[PDB]
Amino acid sequence: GSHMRNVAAEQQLRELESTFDGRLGFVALDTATGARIAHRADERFPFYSTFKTMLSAAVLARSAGDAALLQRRIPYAKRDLVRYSPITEKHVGAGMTVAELCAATLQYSDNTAANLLIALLGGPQAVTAYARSIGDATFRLDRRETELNTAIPGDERDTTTPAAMAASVRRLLVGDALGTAQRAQLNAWMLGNKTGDARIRAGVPAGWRVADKTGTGDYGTGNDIGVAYPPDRAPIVFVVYTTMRSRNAQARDDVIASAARIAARAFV
Ligand SMILES: *[B]([O])([O])[C][N]C(=O)/C(=N\OC([C])([C])C([O])=O)C1=[C]SC([N])=N1
Protein backbone atom coordinates (compact mmCIF):
# COMPACT_ATOMS: atom_id res chain seq x y z
CA GLY A 1 0.00 0.00 0.00
CA SER A 2 0.91 3.67 -0.17
CA HIS A 3 -0.30 7.12 0.78
CA MET A 4 -0.88 7.91 -2.89
CA ARG A 5 -3.15 4.86 -3.25
CA ASN A 6 -5.05 5.83 -0.10
CA VAL A 7 -5.57 9.37 -1.40
CA ALA A 8 -6.80 7.92 -4.70
CA ALA A 9 -9.22 5.71 -2.73
CA GLU A 10 -10.54 8.76 -0.91
CA GLN A 11 -11.13 10.50 -4.23
CA GLN A 12 -12.97 7.39 -5.45
CA LEU A 13 -15.15 7.50 -2.30
CA ARG A 14 -16.07 11.12 -3.04
CA GLU A 15 -16.98 10.12 -6.58
CA LEU A 16 -19.08 7.26 -5.21
CA GLU A 17 -20.93 9.64 -2.90
CA SER A 18 -21.91 11.76 -5.90
CA THR A 19 -23.83 8.77 -7.35
CA PHE A 20 -26.61 8.92 -4.75
CA ASP A 21 -28.68 11.42 -2.77
CA GLY A 22 -27.00 11.61 0.61
CA ARG A 23 -23.71 11.28 2.47
CA LEU A 24 -21.15 8.49 2.68
CA GLY A 25 -19.23 8.05 5.95
CA PHE A 26 -16.39 5.62 5.51
CA VAL A 27 -13.33 4.37 7.35
CA ALA A 28 -11.12 1.42 6.49
CA LEU A 29 -8.10 0.55 8.64
CA ASP A 30 -5.32 -1.76 7.50
CA THR A 31 -4.17 -3.37 10.74
CA ALA A 32 -0.82 -4.36 9.17
CA THR A 33 0.27 -0.71 9.15
CA GLY A 34 -2.45 1.33 10.82
CA ALA A 35 -3.10 3.09 7.50
CA ARG A 36 -6.54 4.67 7.20
CA ILE A 37 -8.78 5.48 4.26
CA ALA A 38 -11.43 7.98 5.36
CA HIS A 39 -14.37 9.98 4.03
CA ARG A 40 -16.47 12.18 6.37
CA ALA A 41 -14.81 10.21 9.15
CA ASP A 42 -15.75 12.64 11.93
CA GLU A 43 -19.35 13.31 10.91
CA ARG A 44 -22.15 11.69 12.90
CA PHE A 45 -24.42 9.10 11.26
CA PRO A 46 -27.34 7.09 12.65
CA PHE A 47 -25.84 3.70 13.45
CA TYR A 48 -29.12 1.71 13.15
CA SER A 49 -28.54 -1.96 13.98
CA THR A 50 -24.76 -1.73 13.88
CA PHE A 51 -24.89 -0.80 17.57
CA LYS A 52 -25.79 -4.45 18.26
CA THR A 53 -22.04 -5.20 18.04
CA MET A 54 -21.37 -2.78 20.92
CA LEU A 55 -24.36 -4.21 22.81
CA SER A 56 -23.15 -7.80 22.43
CA ALA A 57 -19.62 -6.81 23.45
CA ALA A 58 -21.02 -5.28 26.64
CA VAL A 59 -22.89 -8.52 27.40
CA LEU A 60 -19.77 -10.58 26.71
CA ALA A 61 -17.70 -8.33 28.99
CA ARG A 62 -20.17 -8.97 31.80
CA SER A 63 -20.10 -12.71 31.07
CA ALA A 64 -16.33 -12.77 31.65
CA GLY A 65 -17.07 -12.36 35.37
CA ASP A 66 -20.24 -14.46 35.45
CA ALA A 67 -19.75 -17.90 33.91
CA ALA A 68 -23.48 -18.65 33.99
CA LEU A 69 -24.74 -15.43 32.38
CA LEU A 70 -24.65 -16.69 28.80
CA GLN A 71 -26.83 -19.67 29.77
CA ARG A 72 -29.36 -17.57 31.73
CA ARG A 73 -32.84 -17.88 30.23
CA ILE A 74 -34.87 -14.69 29.79
CA PRO A 75 -38.66 -15.14 29.52
CA TYR A 76 -40.80 -12.75 27.46
CA ALA A 77 -44.26 -12.66 25.87
CA LYS A 78 -45.81 -11.72 22.53
CA ARG A 79 -46.55 -8.21 23.85
CA ASP A 80 -42.79 -7.67 24.25
CA LEU A 81 -42.06 -8.25 20.57
CA VAL A 82 -41.20 -5.20 18.49
CA ARG A 83 -41.06 -5.08 14.70
CA TYR A 84 -38.55 -7.42 13.00
CA SER A 85 -38.01 -10.18 15.53
CA PRO A 86 -37.55 -13.28 13.33
CA ILE A 87 -35.91 -15.42 16.01
CA THR A 88 -37.44 -14.20 19.28
CA GLU A 89 -40.97 -14.52 17.88
CA LYS A 90 -40.33 -18.29 17.79
CA HIS A 91 -39.67 -18.61 21.51
CA VAL A 92 -42.34 -16.55 23.28
CA GLY A 93 -43.11 -17.86 26.77
CA ALA A 94 -40.03 -19.47 28.31
CA GLY A 95 -37.82 -17.32 26.07
CA MET A 96 -34.18 -17.70 25.12
CA THR A 97 -30.76 -17.80 26.73
CA VAL A 98 -28.53 -14.74 26.78
CA ALA A 99 -26.13 -16.41 24.30
CA GLU A 100 -29.03 -17.23 21.99
CA LEU A 101 -30.23 -13.62 22.20
CA CYS A 102 -26.76 -12.36 21.26
CA ALA A 103 -26.56 -14.75 18.31
CA ALA A 104 -30.04 -13.73 17.16
CA THR A 105 -29.44 -10.00 17.40
CA LEU A 106 -26.04 -10.25 15.65
CA GLN A 107 -26.82 -12.79 12.93
CA TYR A 108 -30.43 -11.89 12.10
CA SER A 109 -30.55 -8.34 13.55
CA ASP A 110 -33.43 -9.43 15.84
CA ASN A 111 -34.84 -6.29 17.50
CA THR A 112 -36.59 -7.83 20.52
CA ALA A 113 -33.38 -9.71 21.32
CA ALA A 114 -31.55 -6.36 21.39
CA ASN A 115 -34.16 -4.84 23.72
CA LEU A 116 -33.94 -7.80 26.09
CA LEU A 117 -30.16 -7.48 26.22
CA ILE A 118 -30.38 -3.69 26.74
CA ALA A 119 -32.71 -4.32 29.69
CA LEU A 120 -30.36 -7.02 31.02
CA LEU A 121 -27.54 -4.46 31.14
CA GLY A 122 -29.68 -1.84 32.89
CA GLY A 123 -30.85 0.32 29.98
CA PRO A 124 -29.40 2.02 26.88
CA GLN A 125 -27.07 4.19 28.98
CA ALA A 126 -25.21 1.02 30.03
CA VAL A 127 -24.24 0.46 26.40
CA THR A 128 -22.91 4.04 26.19
CA ALA A 129 -21.00 3.45 29.43
CA TYR A 130 -19.48 0.30 27.95
CA ALA A 131 -18.38 2.24 24.86
CA ARG A 132 -16.63 4.78 27.10
CA SER A 133 -14.85 1.94 28.91
CA ILE A 134 -13.23 0.77 25.65
CA GLY A 135 -12.16 4.26 24.63
CA ASP A 136 -15.11 5.36 22.49
CA ALA A 137 -16.13 8.89 23.49
CA THR A 138 -18.41 9.31 20.50
CA PHE A 139 -20.93 6.48 20.53
CA ARG A 140 -24.24 7.21 22.25
CA LEU A 141 -27.23 4.88 22.63
CA ASP A 142 -30.23 6.93 23.72
CA ARG A 143 -33.24 4.82 22.81
CA ARG A 144 -34.34 1.20 22.32
CA GLU A 145 -35.65 -0.62 19.23
CA THR A 146 -37.30 0.52 17.11
CA GLU A 147 -37.32 4.23 17.99
CA LEU A 148 -33.53 4.50 17.71
CA ASN A 149 -33.91 4.26 13.91
CA THR A 150 -35.69 7.63 13.38
CA ALA A 151 -32.61 9.34 11.88
CA ILE A 152 -34.01 12.87 12.19
CA PRO A 153 -31.76 15.49 10.51
CA GLY A 154 -29.40 17.04 13.06
CA ASP A 155 -30.46 14.64 15.85
CA GLU A 156 -27.35 13.25 17.51
CA ARG A 157 -29.21 10.57 19.47
CA ASP A 158 -28.20 7.02 18.52
CA THR A 159 -25.28 8.11 16.39
CA THR A 160 -21.57 7.65 16.11
CA THR A 161 -18.85 8.64 13.62
CA PRO A 162 -17.15 6.33 11.12
CA ALA A 163 -13.79 7.00 12.83
CA ALA A 164 -15.05 6.16 16.32
CA MET A 165 -16.84 3.01 15.23
CA ALA A 166 -13.82 1.81 13.24
CA ALA A 167 -11.60 2.29 16.29
CA SER A 168 -14.09 0.38 18.46
CA VAL A 169 -14.50 -2.46 15.94
CA ARG A 170 -10.71 -2.75 15.77
CA ARG A 171 -10.33 -2.87 19.55
CA LEU A 172 -13.19 -5.36 19.94
CA LEU A 173 -12.51 -7.85 17.14
CA VAL A 174 -8.75 -7.55 16.63
CA GLY A 175 -7.47 -5.80 19.75
CA ASP A 176 -7.58 -5.88 23.51
CA ALA A 177 -10.98 -4.49 24.52
CA LEU A 178 -12.31 -7.94 25.51
CA GLY A 179 -10.72 -11.02 27.01
CA THR A 180 -9.50 -13.76 24.63
CA ALA A 181 -12.53 -16.00 24.85
CA GLN A 182 -15.00 -13.12 24.55
CA ARG A 183 -13.22 -11.54 21.58
CA ALA A 184 -13.32 -14.96 19.93
CA GLN A 185 -17.04 -15.40 20.61
CA LEU A 186 -17.84 -11.97 19.18
CA ASN A 187 -15.86 -12.85 16.04
CA ALA A 188 -17.58 -16.23 15.77
CA TRP A 189 -21.04 -14.67 15.99
CA MET A 190 -20.28 -11.93 13.48
CA LEU A 191 -18.57 -14.36 11.06
CA GLY A 192 -21.90 -16.19 11.01
CA ASN A 193 -23.98 -13.11 10.12
CA LYS A 194 -26.84 -13.91 7.73
CA THR A 195 -27.84 -10.38 6.68
CA GLY A 196 -24.77 -8.90 5.00
CA ASP A 197 -24.01 -10.98 1.91
CA ALA A 198 -24.68 -8.06 -0.46
CA ARG A 199 -22.77 -5.37 1.48
CA ILE A 200 -19.11 -5.36 2.69
CA ARG A 201 -18.88 -9.07 1.80
CA ALA A 202 -19.79 -8.32 -1.82
CA GLY A 203 -16.93 -5.81 -2.15
CA VAL A 204 -14.01 -7.95 -0.96
CA PRO A 205 -12.26 -10.94 -2.58
CA ALA A 206 -13.93 -14.37 -2.25
CA GLY A 207 -11.29 -15.95 -0.02
CA TRP A 208 -11.63 -13.26 2.64
CA ARG A 209 -13.67 -14.11 5.73
CA VAL A 210 -15.92 -11.30 6.86
CA ALA A 211 -17.25 -10.63 10.35
CA ASP A 212 -19.89 -7.94 9.92
CA LYS A 213 -23.02 -6.35 11.35
CA THR A 214 -25.49 -4.57 9.07
CA GLY A 215 -27.89 -1.74 9.77
CA THR A 216 -31.04 -0.70 7.97
CA GLY A 217 -33.39 2.20 8.61
CA ASP A 218 -36.29 3.86 6.74
CA TYR A 219 -36.45 4.67 3.10
CA GLY A 220 -33.97 2.06 1.82
CA THR A 221 -31.12 3.39 3.93
CA GLY A 222 -28.39 1.10 5.13
CA ASN A 223 -24.91 0.59 6.49
CA ASP A 224 -22.43 -2.16 7.45
CA ILE A 225 -19.48 -2.50 9.81
CA GLY A 226 -16.95 -5.24 10.34
CA VAL A 227 -13.57 -6.84 9.87
CA ALA A 228 -12.31 -8.76 6.87
CA TYR A 229 -9.80 -11.52 7.42
CA PRO A 230 -7.71 -12.05 4.28
CA PRO A 231 -6.25 -15.56 4.09
CA ASP A 232 -2.57 -14.58 4.30
CA ARG A 233 -2.38 -10.93 5.33
CA ALA A 234 -3.53 -8.76 8.25
CA PRO A 235 -7.18 -7.99 9.04
CA ILE A 236 -8.82 -4.88 7.61
CA VAL A 237 -11.52 -2.94 9.46
CA PHE A 238 -14.45 -1.57 7.40
CA VAL A 239 -17.05 0.96 8.52
CA VAL A 240 -19.63 2.15 5.98
CA TYR A 241 -22.34 4.55 7.12
CA THR A 242 -24.72 6.43 4.85
CA THR A 243 -27.66 8.79 4.76
CA MET A 244 -28.61 7.30 1.36
CA ARG A 245 -32.31 7.17 0.52
CA SER A 246 -32.73 4.70 -2.36
CA ARG A 247 -35.57 3.36 -4.50
CA ASN A 248 -34.47 -0.24 -3.84
CA ALA A 249 -32.27 -2.44 -1.66
CA GLN A 250 -29.90 -3.38 -4.49
CA ALA A 251 -28.88 0.23 -5.12
CA ARG A 252 -28.14 0.71 -1.44
CA ASP A 253 -26.17 -2.53 -1.14
CA ASP A 254 -24.16 -1.77 -4.28
CA VAL A 255 -22.95 1.51 -2.80
CA ILE A 256 -21.78 -0.21 0.38
CA ALA A 257 -20.08 -3.01 -1.55
CA SER A 258 -18.41 -0.45 -3.85
CA ALA A 259 -17.05 1.52 -0.90
CA ALA A 260 -15.48 -1.65 0.54
CA ARG A 261 -14.10 -2.58 -2.90
CA ILE A 262 -12.36 0.79 -3.15
CA ALA A 263 -10.49 0.25 0.12
CA ALA A 264 -9.67 -3.40 -0.63
CA ARG A 265 -8.11 -2.25 -3.92
CA ALA A 266 -5.88 0.23 -2.09
CA PHE A 267 -4.75 -2.19 0.63
CA VAL A 268 -3.96 -5.37 -1.35
B1 LIG B 1 -31.45 -2.95 12.08
O2 LIG B 1 -31.05 -1.61 11.57
O3 LIG B 1 -30.96 -4.06 11.22
C4 LIG B 1 -32.97 -3.08 12.53
N5 LIG B 1 -33.77 -2.91 11.32
C6 LIG B 1 -35.04 -2.67 11.33
O7 LIG B 1 -35.68 -2.57 12.30
C8 LIG B 1 -35.64 -2.38 10.07
N9 LIG B 1 -35.77 -3.23 9.17
O10 LIG B 1 -35.45 -4.41 9.23
C11 LIG B 1 -34.99 -5.11 8.08
C12 LIG B 1 -35.34 -4.38 6.77
C13 LIG B 1 -35.60 -6.48 8.11
C14 LIG B 1 -33.50 -5.32 8.11
O15 LIG B 1 -33.06 -5.80 7.05
O16 LIG B 1 -32.83 -4.98 9.11
C17 LIG B 1 -36.11 -1.05 9.90
C18 LIG B 1 -36.75 -0.78 8.73
S19 LIG B 1 -37.25 0.78 8.73
C20 LIG B 1 -36.65 0.99 10.27
N21 LIG B 1 -36.85 2.09 10.77
N22 LIG B 1 -36.07 -0.06 10.82
69's CB contacts (< 8 A; 6+ apart) are 59, 62, 63, 98
Single-letter code of the amino acid located at 118: I
Q: DSSP state, 68? A: T
Indicate the resolution in Å.
1.4
Q: Is the CB of 216 under 6 A from ligand 1?
A: yes
Q: What angle do CA 221, 54, 103 make, to 5 degrees?
A: 85
Q: What is the tally of helices (H) and strands (E) in the chain?
A: 9, 9
Closest CA to 216 of 118, 136, 108: 108
Closest CA to 105 of 93, 95, 117: 117
Experimental method: X-ray
How many residues belong to the chain? 268
CB 122 within 8 A of CB 92: no
How far apart are the CA of 33 and the centre of ligand 1, in A?
35
Q: Is 129 exposed, middle or buried, given 0-12, 13-18 or 19+ CB atoms closer than 10 A?
A: middle
Q: Is the CB of 48 under 6 A from ligand 1?
A: yes
Closest CA to 246 of 218, 206, 224: 218
**DSSP per-residue letters across 91-158:** STEEEEEHHHHHHHHHHS--HHHHHHHHHHHTSHHHHHHHHHHTT-SS----S-TTGGG---TT--TT
CB 200 within 8 A of CB 257: yes
Q: DSSP state, 49? A: G
Query: Which of 53, 88, 109 to probe ligand 1 with, by most ligand atoms within 8 A of CB?
Result: 109
Helix, strand and coil content of the chain, in percent to the nearest 5, comes to 45, 20, 35
Domain spanning 1-268 has what CATH number?
A: 3.40.710.10
Q: Where are the domains of the chain?
A: 1-268
H or E element in which residue 224 lies: strand 222-229
**Could you give the CA distance from residue 208 to residue 189 in angstroms, rounded to a whole number?**
16
How far apart are the CA of 65 and the centre of ligand 1, in A?
32
